[PDB]
């Protein structure tokens, strides 16, 4: 049966200006089945309070969710999202780039 792999975008809600409040988001989309592990990481450590949207899906039935957390960017700190799903042999890590 169908297995579709998650597309992952990790980004902030507002343009990242260091010292200022923002939300780090990891949008995972286009997957099936719906079990998927998504973590947001700060310098490698998994971030403790990450919330997400309520499971919904697109026209082709694949799923999408938005995981997000409050953060204040620094030039120094590194952020990333780590995702797991049956379609992924190993947890896919995508690093946040503020120009993307």
């Amino acid at each position: 049966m169908i297995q579709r792999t998650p597309k992952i975008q990790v980004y902030s809600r507002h343009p990242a200006e260091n010292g200022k409040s923002n939300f780090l988001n990891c949008y995972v989309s286009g997957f099936h089945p719906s079990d998927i592990e998504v973590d947001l990481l700060k310098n490698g450590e998994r971030i403790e309070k990450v919330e997400h949207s309520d499971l919904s899906f697109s026209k082709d039935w694949s799923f999408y969710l938005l995981y997000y957390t409050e953060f204040t960017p620094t030039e120094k700190d590194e952020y990333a999202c780590r995702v797991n799903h049956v379609t992924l042999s190993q947890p896919k890590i995508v690093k946040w780039d503020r120009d993307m």
Partner: protein, 275 residues
């Protein structure tokens, strides 16, 4: 302003580890307004947009009763379909249902939907005439025959052409300021040197509502469709969306390129040029 209301339902079997998971969300256009989740403490239909929060106990109690009735049907649907396909009681399976209605600029009925899918594949769907069914296979056809006998499509034609459109219009004026609004994109470009003879031009579209947008790059007036990287419109997480489009420019040629933005919130389409 054309509009839609949609209900998305997801049930997933948890063989061995409890009762199946059932998530139900409702959306008017691109704004989610309610949710119900089986694994939640309240076991109630919950508001997800402020404009719905002020509905009375009658609304919440009635939709909780209905979404919980929805929940039982979908758990029964997991066993039924497993039977149809002679599957094991070990593996997890998914059923998804979507229904809703689309209205025109005149807010009159434009079309209604009722689609069912097993394990990510179309199972049965009501056709546009809101009279016939599209049964994928023999199992789907067993279900169609049950739904024909139950005078199900006829019951659905009345909901989508009536009730759905009626409450859609009530949600539209009751959440006027929210989902009868448009946010135009806040646009901008970045330029970064990937090396000595080449650079990336990224065109940004941020804080727009609704999620539709056409973000395009052109070189000398010609489309650069295959030579553009375009991300999928993301949610910003505050009810608006984001999107970008990029091209790798040969240095000296930034001026040949133009970003073109189309969005309902824009009086005139945008044409940006790095210069």
């Amino acid at each position: 302003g054309s509009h839609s209301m949609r209900y998305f339902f997801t049930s997933v079997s948890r063989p061995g580890r409890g009762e199946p998971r059932f998530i139900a969300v409702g959306y008017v256009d691109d704004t989610q307004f309610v949710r119900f989740d089986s694994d939640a403490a309240s076991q109630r239909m919950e508001p997800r947009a402020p404009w719905i929060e002020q509905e009375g106990p009658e609304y919440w109690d009635g939709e909780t009763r209905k979404v919980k009735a929805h929940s039982q049907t979908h758990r029964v649907d997991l066993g039924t379909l497993r039977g149809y396909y002679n599957q094991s009681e070990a593996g997890s399976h998914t059923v998804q249902r979507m229904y809703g209605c689309d209205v025109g600029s005149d807010w009159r009925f434009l079309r209604g939907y009722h689609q069912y899918a097993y394990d990510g594949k179309d199972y049965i769907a009501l056709k546009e005439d809101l009279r016939s069914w599209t049964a994928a296979d023999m199992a789907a056809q067993t279900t169609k025959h049950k739904w024909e006998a139950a005078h199900v499509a006829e019951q659905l034609r009345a909901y989508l052409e009536g009730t759905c459109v009626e409450w859609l219009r009530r949600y539209l004026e009751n959440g006027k300021e929210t989902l009868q609004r448009t946010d135009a994109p806040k646009t901008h470009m970045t330029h970064h040197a990937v090396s000595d003879h080449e650079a990336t031009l990224r065109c940004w579209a941020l804080s727009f509502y609704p999620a539709e947008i056409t973000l395009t790059w052109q070189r000398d007036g010609e489309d650069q469709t295959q030579d553009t990287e375009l991300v999928e419109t993301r949610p910003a997480g505050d009810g608006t969306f984001q999107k970008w489009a990029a091209v790798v420019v040969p240095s000296g040629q930034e001026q040949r390129y133009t970003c073109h933005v189309q969005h309902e919130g824009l009086p005139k389409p945008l044409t940006l040029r790095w210069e």
